[PDB]
Amino acid sequence: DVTLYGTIKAGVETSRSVFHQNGQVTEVTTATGIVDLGSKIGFKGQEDLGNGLKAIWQVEQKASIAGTDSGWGNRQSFIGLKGGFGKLRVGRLNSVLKDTGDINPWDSKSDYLGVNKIAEPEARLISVRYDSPEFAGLSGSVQYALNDNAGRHNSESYHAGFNYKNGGFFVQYGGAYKRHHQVQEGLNIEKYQIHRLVSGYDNDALYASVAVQQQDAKLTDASNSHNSQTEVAATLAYRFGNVTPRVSYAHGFKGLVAKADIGNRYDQVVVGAEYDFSKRTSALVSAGWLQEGKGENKFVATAGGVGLRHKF
Amino acid sequence: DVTLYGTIKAGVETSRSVFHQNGQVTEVTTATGIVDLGSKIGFKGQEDLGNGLKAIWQVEQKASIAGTDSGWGNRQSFIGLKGGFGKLRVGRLNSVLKDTGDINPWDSKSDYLGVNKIAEPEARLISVRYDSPEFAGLSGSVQYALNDNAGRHNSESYHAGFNYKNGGFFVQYGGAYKRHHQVQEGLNIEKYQIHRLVSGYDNDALYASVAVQQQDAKLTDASNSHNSQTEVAATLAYRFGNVTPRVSYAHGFKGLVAKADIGNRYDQVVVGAEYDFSKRTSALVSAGWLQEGKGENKFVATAGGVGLRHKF
């Protein structure tokens, strides 16, 4: 069983970013560009080893149709075993966090055409992951990333999650703890933990999801100042034949973060539709609004885009 | 429909470059090396979407057998749609220019073993391209590359071309306009335009081609000095069973270019033969001469090479 698979997706996006600083406009920048929406190519396989035991492997790469990427195995890549005991994998693996929701189902490159801000702590990392068998809707996962694989200024990290599925209803949890975390521009953070909870309903013609996410850590400053951030995101989609409109809203609460991201409070909505020419090929259109102000020092972004997506 | 394809081609080249500066020899350099002639590997597919409509995609990479290249999609890569209306593609795409002739059919790495100088403004770039259906020999193409995709010192660019084909006879035109163009070592240029016209006869046992190319631009110097260059290239090939000798001649007229390329006037001839072991596998041999002097400050290059090429 050796399979070549991938997703090719690209389109065009335009956007406009406005800083109001109580004087109305202080800055206006625009952007209009053809962009890749995250095209990828992978190789994978499995082998039946008998007694229900299986070998599994995958080597998956970024393959932007812009021709900008390079690297083998820089997307999710692993080897492992799977059988009655569950599934054990090693390699460059999604964090449990990254697998908890499909919290950002938008194919977009602009940060205003998807629910990107809440998705940002998601990552792949070199680690070991155990995924349990499913028993009556319930499964779980534990994952560990060693201190040596993390680098000089990054500690080991612990990851856990559980999932429940019954019919179209689901709830997923995922969390992580990290002793030392490098922030590249600013002061680093310690005792970082993130927790995410998602619940919704998923099937044909009806998709709904709501997610809340909490991050906490201590700043490596003169006082070990606590930092925290809370974010919620909800999306709703409904399929009419070949067309599926969806809408997303996300909100970031005013949180104690040193970074100038920072996050300050934000609100965003993304709106759009997919048109399916087939089960593998879809056209995409979307539009988005984001405000990171208070009403006074507003940052207002608008954007729109169209795209094409093909799976194979 | 998911296809893996490619061209593997390599050989060995030797060359000798002589600067005469009215004293006869001022410099003599030589080069003898095993070289890759542009090996490549790609993935592509299409899907019938019904009503004669189709999804198309390709991800194509450099894959030198020297093992020097890296990158996904750094050759022609795209997604698009094709149907009765014609063909629309987006991604890293050949400029119309690059598709107008097969002006340099030589597989070579040395600049003296192919018609390389005239081919140099050819490129791939991130853009949108529309290719029309063919009606009684006639088709056309328009292509646009956005200012944001081009970089900070490069403007948007416009590309157009038309083709005519009837039996073995063809004529192809291709042009481009670019408001701002960065030249890396020298002063940048503005209002750059290039036009190329090619006509010839192509089939089994008889290939002939002649091409003329004109470039014009304004120099970003103290006076907006006009710059221009004109070049012609002709090649002739004839197949005797398994062997196909061909010869090329190219001439660059003495043109107003600031660059020390510059181009000054040049003449070159390339001579060679392909031997086909099969429809996919060919042996290659070639030899070349180039003079970039006036007769006084001559630069004289000679070269030879042998190679092997396999398509799959």
Added chain:
Amino acid sequence: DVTLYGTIKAGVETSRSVFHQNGQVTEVTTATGIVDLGSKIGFKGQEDLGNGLKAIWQVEQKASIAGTDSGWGNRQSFIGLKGGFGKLRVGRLNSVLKDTGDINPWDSKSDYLGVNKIAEPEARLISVRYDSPEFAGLSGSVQYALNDNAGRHNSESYHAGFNYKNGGFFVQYGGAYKRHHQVQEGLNIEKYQIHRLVSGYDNDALYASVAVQQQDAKLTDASNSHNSQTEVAATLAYRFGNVTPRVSYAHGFKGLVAKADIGNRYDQVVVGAEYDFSKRTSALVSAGWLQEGKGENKFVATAGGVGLRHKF
């Protein structure tokens, strides 16, 4: 004939390195990490050209499951022809040396979990290689790497080897000569030659091998000081059903090398077992000890590891 193939292999290794400097411990460092053991993906093909003649090609890349590698064709990649006359290849090719033994059959990333030190002069390089047909157990190889392909501070190099095989018994020889060789940190060397001889017995259930390796060169210092190094390695394996324990010992003699590698004298043993779930999938475990001291300034390393390997 177009084939996609590869080896995916990864596991976890722990090690501990101790410097004794007559005071007992001066330094103790440890390392525990998930690691890729040299995963790779390749494309290859051949075409029957008639009369027993064949075209052959391969493009093979590193593809670490850590996601750290990049490059096409950065493992063994070539094009060539094969027929009654033998086999002729061009491209990035194993040196004859690298093909003489399977002197280090350990999949390991730590230098203490394989016979790595003796294997270090092995390399791939851009070159031409001729491999003879086999006549009554005997074959040979000659290989040449041009001065231009080698770089500015590296000369051309000559490679030769012969092989004998009869039943499970083999003897292999491989050597190389290199006029100028750059050493990156230290003084460069000249008139470098390496010779390796390996003999052993190989089949089902019984593998034995012994190898001796000699290197000589002149140092580009004030006196053209001679430098030399001698190393021996032996390994023994026996298969019991699905399990195959093996052991290796290697010794480096006290040799005249300027480098602080340097090599000083060393002894090492590696011990381990492969468990085969199938002909393509194997679990691995190993442990290793190395001493680079004299008894006084000892460097003592221990290590252990477990891994999984799948071929396709």
